Amino acid sequence: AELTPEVLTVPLNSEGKTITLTEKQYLEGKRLFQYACASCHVGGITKTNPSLDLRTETLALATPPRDNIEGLVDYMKNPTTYDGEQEIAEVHPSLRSADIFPKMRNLTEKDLVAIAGHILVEPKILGDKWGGGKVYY
Template sequence: MLMLNRLIMLLKKSMFSLISICLFVFTLVVLPTVAIELDEATRTIILDNSGQTVVLTPEQVKRGKRLFNNSCAQCHNGGITKTNPNVGLELESLSLATPARDTINSLIDYMKSPTSYDGQYSISELHPSIKSAEIFPKMRNLTDEDLFSVAGYILLQDKILPEKWGGGKIYY
């Protein structure tokens, strides 16, 4: 009887291990292929004030996400602004800034040389930017292509997560 109980325990452990391995393989192999692919209409973002649009490539979206998480998410996780929760990265807040920051080119301009929300003065010593890369080392190696990807990613989030992006304490 004791031997039978040991055999049953061994079989249970083996089954648990087998199930764990199967779940691990499923997570690595199957789930990435099931990931949601953003369609072209969703990836279409306004480029400049003239209304010209650009379609982000999936690679630009992935790159923008990685760069945003590495360089911006510490203060802007989920599109909020930790230092001023009244101003987020959602399209409405970006469009109400002076000058408006609701296009890729305007966001790139902001990331190069940031100004206050009303556009009255430079905040490059307070906000990470290319202009203040000596103060904010994460900005040192960002190219124009990197800034394009980050700006595109920020504007894309308002389309993907319209309720959550920039939602502040309600969601994050």
């Protein structure tokens, strides 16, 4: 098994358009995700709220859908609750709240794309492990 271009091809937007990441983009995504996100989202779960995970199936049912690059990038800019009803930037790291979550200050658009790509590709590799929790360790 290898990290092929097929694996690295993910939904760009809701309309079904895809983008193909490079191995470098994917690895950069992993590194950045470890840097800014993993303290809470290690392995695709959420430590401070285990009800919501980062499985693609979950992201697809968020409002608005987050199972694609644009959705995730927007989320990292202006995060909402799962139903889209509330803006939670004040308690969730984002570009909108980079003043209170300083690690978000040195993240660029390219970086948000990388992180998104990592979040979408990982489940294609790890299957149930991603979002699965200790049961699948």
